[PDB]
Coordinates of N, CA and C in Angstrom, one line a residue:
Chain Z
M1 N 9.2 -13.9 -15.1 CA 8.1 -14.0 -14.6 C 7.4 -14.3 -13.5
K2 N 7.8 -15.4 -12.8 CA 7.8 -16.2 -11.8 C 8.4 -15.2 -10.0
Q3 N 9.3 -14.8 -10.4 CA 10.6 -14.4 -8.8 C 9.5 -12.5 -9.2
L4 N 8.9 -12.3 -10.1 CA 8.4 -11.4 -9.8 C 7.5 -10.9 -9.9
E5 N 6.6 -12.1 -10.0 CA 5.3 -12.4 -9.4 C 5.4 -12.5 -8.0
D6 N 6.6 -13.2 -7.6 CA 6.4 -13.3 -6.3 C 6.0 -12.1 -5.4
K7 N 7.4 -10.9 -5.9 CA 7.3 -9.5 -5.2 C 6.3 -9.0 -5.4
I8 N 5.5 -9.0 -6.5 CA 4.0 -8.4 -6.8 C 3.5 -8.7 -5.5
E9 N 3.4 -10.7 -5.3 CA 2.2 -10.7 -4.4 C 3.1 -10.0 -3.1
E10 N 3.8 -10.6 -2.6 CA 4.6 -10.0 -1.2 C 4.2 -8.4 -1.5
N11 N 4.2 -7.3 -1.9 CA 3.0 -6.1 -2.2 C 1.7 -6.4 -2.2
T12 N 1.3 -7.1 -2.1 CA -0.3 -7.3 -2.8 C -0.6 -7.7 -1.1
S13 N -0.2 -8.9 -0.3 CA -0.4 -8.8 0.9 C 0.1 -7.4 1.9
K14 N 1.2 -7.1 1.7 CA 0.9 -5.5 2.5 C 0.4 -4.8 2.8
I15 N -0.1 -4.5 1.2 CA -1.5 -3.8 1.1 C -2.9 -4.2 1.7
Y16 N -3.1 -5.6 1.4 CA -3.7 -6.2 2.7 C -4.2 -5.9 3.3
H17 N -2.6 -5.9 4.5 CA -2.9 -5.6 6.1 C -3.1 -4.1 6.3
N18 N -2.0 -3.7 5.4 CA -2.1 -2.0 5.6 C -4.0 -1.8 5.4
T19 N -4.5 -2.0 4.1 CA -5.8 -1.7 4.7 C -7.1 -2.1 5.5
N20 N -6.8 -3.4 5.9 CA -7.4 -3.1 7.5 C -7.2 -2.7 8.3
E21 N -5.9 -2.4 8.3 CA -5.6 -0.9 9.9 C -6.0 0.2 9.5
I22 N -5.9 0.4 8.2 CA -6.2 1.8 8.1 C -8.0 1.7 7.9
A23 N -9.0 0.6 7.5 CA -10.2 0.5 8.1 C -10.0 0.7 9.6
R24 N -9.4 0.2 11.0 CA -9.8 0.1 12.2 C -9.7 1.3 12.3
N25 N -8.5 2.1 12.1 CA -7.9 3.7 12.8 C -8.9 4.1 12.2
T26 N -9.9 4.0 10.5 CA -11.0 5.3 10.5 C -12.7 4.7 11.0
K27 N -12.9 3.6 12.0 CA -13.8 3.4 12.9 C -13.3 4.5 14.5
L28 N -12.0 3.9 14.6 CA -11.5 5.1 16.0 C -11.6 6.3 16.0
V29 N -11.3 6.9 14.7 CA -11.4 8.4 14.5 C -12.9 9.0 14.8
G30 N -13.7 8.0 14.0 CA -15.4 7.9 13.8 C -15.8 8.4 15.2
Chain H
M1 N 4.2 -9.9 -20.3 CA 5.0 -8.0 -19.7 C 3.4 -7.5 -19.2
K2 N 2.3 -7.6 -19.9 CA 1.1 -7.2 -20.6 C 0.3 -7.7 -18.8
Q3 N -0.3 -8.9 -18.8 CA -1.2 -9.3 -17.5 C -0.1 -8.8 -16.1
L4 N 1.7 -9.0 -15.7 CA 2.0 -8.7 -14.9 C 1.9 -6.8 -14.9
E5 N 2.1 -6.3 -16.1 CA 1.7 -4.5 -15.5 C 0.0 -4.4 -15.7
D6 N -1.0 -5.2 -15.4 CA -1.9 -5.5 -14.8 C -2.1 -5.1 -13.3
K7 N -1.7 -6.0 -13.3 CA -1.5 -6.4 -11.5 C -0.5 -5.7 -11.0
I8 N 0.1 -5.3 -11.3 CA 0.9 -3.9 -10.5 C 0.1 -2.5 -10.7
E9 N -0.3 -2.5 -11.5 CA -1.4 -1.1 -11.3 C -2.7 -1.4 -10.8
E10 N -3.4 -2.6 -10.6 CA -4.3 -2.4 -9.5 C -3.6 -2.1 -8.4
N11 N -2.5 -2.7 -7.8 CA -1.5 -2.8 -6.8 C -1.4 -0.7 -6.5
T12 N -1.0 -0.2 -7.5 CA -0.6 1.3 -7.7 C -1.7 1.9 -7.4
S13 N -3.7 1.5 -8.2 CA -4.5 1.8 -7.2 C -5.1 1.6 -6.2
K14 N -4.6 0.5 -5.7 CA -4.9 0.6 -3.6 C -4.2 1.2 -3.3
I15 N -2.9 1.4 -3.5 CA -2.5 1.9 -3.0 C -2.4 3.8 -2.7
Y16 N -3.0 4.3 -4.0 CA -3.3 5.4 -4.2 C -4.7 5.7 -3.3
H17 N -5.5 5.0 -3.0 CA -7.0 5.1 -2.5 C -6.5 5.0 -0.8
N18 N -5.2 4.5 -0.4 CA -4.7 3.8 0.7 C -4.4 5.7 1.3
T19 N -3.6 5.5 0.8 CA -2.7 7.3 0.8 C -3.7 8.1 1.0
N20 N -4.9 8.4 -0.1 CA -5.9 9.5 0.6 C -6.0 9.5 2.1
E21 N -7.2 7.9 2.3 CA -7.4 7.7 3.4 C -6.8 7.7 4.8
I22 N -5.3 7.3 4.7 CA -4.4 7.3 5.6 C -4.3 9.1 6.4
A23 N -4.6 9.6 4.8 CA -4.1 11.5 4.6 C -5.4 11.7 5.7
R24 N -6.6 11.7 5.4 CA -7.8 11.7 6.0 C -7.4 11.2 7.7
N25 N -7.4 10.3 8.0 CA -7.1 10.0 9.3 C -5.8 10.6 10.0
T26 N -4.9 11.4 9.2 CA -4.0 11.9 9.8 C -4.2 13.3 10.6
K27 N -5.3 14.3 9.1 CA -5.9 15.1 9.6 C -6.9 15.4 11.0
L28 N -7.6 14.0 11.1 CA -8.4 13.9 12.3 C -7.5 13.6 13.3
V29 N -6.6 12.8 13.5 CA -6.0 13.0 14.5 C -5.5 14.2 15.1
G30 N -4.8 14.8 14.3 CA -4.3 15.9 14.6 C -5.0 17.2 14.7
Chain K
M1 N 12.0 -6.9 -17.9 CA 12.2 -7.5 -16.7 C 12.6 -5.6 -15.8
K2 N 13.6 -5.1 -16.4 CA 13.8 -4.3 -15.7 C 13.0 -2.6 -15.2
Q3 N 12.0 -2.8 -16.2 CA 11.2 -1.1 -15.9 C 10.4 -1.7 -15.1
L4 N 10.0 -3.2 -15.4 CA 8.8 -3.9 -14.3 C 9.4 -3.3 -12.8
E5 N 10.2 -4.3 -12.7 CA 11.2 -4.0 -11.5 C 11.6 -2.7 -10.5
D6 N 11.8 -1.1 -11.7 CA 11.4 -0.5 -11.3 C 10.1 0.3 -11.1
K7 N 9.0 -0.1 -11.5 CA 7.6 0.0 -10.9 C 7.2 -0.7 -9.6
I8 N 7.6 -1.9 -9.5 CA 7.4 -2.9 -8.2 C 7.9 -2.0 -7.1
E9 N 8.9 -1.4 -7.3 CA 10.3 -0.9 -6.5 C 9.8 0.2 -6.2
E10 N 9.0 0.8 -7.0 CA 8.6 2.1 -6.3 C 7.0 1.9 -5.5
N11 N 6.3 1.0 -5.7 CA 5.5 0.8 -4.9 C 5.6 0.1 -3.6
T12 N 6.7 -0.2 -3.5 CA 7.0 -1.0 -2.2 C 7.5 -0.1 -1.3
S13 N 8.3 1.0 -1.9 CA 8.6 2.2 -1.5 C 7.4 3.0 -0.8
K14 N 6.1 3.2 -1.5 CA 4.8 4.1 -1.4 C 4.6 2.9 0.0
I15 N 4.4 1.5 -0.3 CA 4.0 0.9 1.2 C 5.0 0.9 2.1
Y16 N 5.8 1.1 2.3 CA 7.1 1.4 2.9 C 6.7 2.7 3.6
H17 N 5.7 3.8 3.3 CA 6.0 5.1 3.9 C 4.8 5.1 4.6
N18 N 3.5 4.7 3.7 CA 2.3 4.5 4.3 C 2.1 3.4 5.1
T19 N 2.6 2.6 6.0 CA 3.3 1.7 6.4 C 3.4 2.7 7.8
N20 N 4.4 3.0 7.9 CA 5.2 4.4 9.1 C 3.4 4.8 9.5
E21 N 3.6 6.0 8.1 CA 2.4 6.6 8.7 C 0.8 5.8 9.5
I22 N 0.8 5.0 9.1 CA -0.1 4.6 9.5 C -0.1 3.8 11.4
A23 N 1.2 3.6 11.3 CA 2.0 3.0 12.6 C 1.6 4.2 13.5
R24 N 1.9 5.5 12.5 CA 2.1 6.8 13.0 C 0.2 6.8 13.8
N25 N -0.7 6.7 12.5 CA -1.8 7.1 13.3 C -2.4 6.0 14.3
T26 N -1.6 4.9 14.4 CA -2.5 3.8 14.9 C -1.7 4.1 16.9
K27 N -0.5 4.7 17.3 CA -0.1 5.1 18.4 C -1.3 5.9 18.6
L28 N -1.8 7.7 18.2 CA -2.1 8.5 18.2 C -4.0 8.2 19.1
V29 N -4.5 6.7 18.2 CA -5.7 6.4 18.2 C -6.1 5.8 19.2
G30 N -4.5 4.9 20.1 CA -4.8 4.2 21.4 C -5.2 5.2 22.6

């Protein structure tokens, strides 16, 4: 369970940062 | 298993939406 | 464990590719 939870959280964090950078680019292309 | 599967699916959904927004921005920057 | 690990890795790969495309768009909007 716990190492798998660690891997999922690493992906959750990568997704978080990507979502912010996508939003930044969305604003610039507007 | 099942709560972990729930978390993975939440990430799969976030990735799905991000992929669509990235494609949108890709088209605009072309 | 193993099928769940497979699903996590599929997400890790999708995130990898999205990160590269986001970087590409970031450079173009600069």
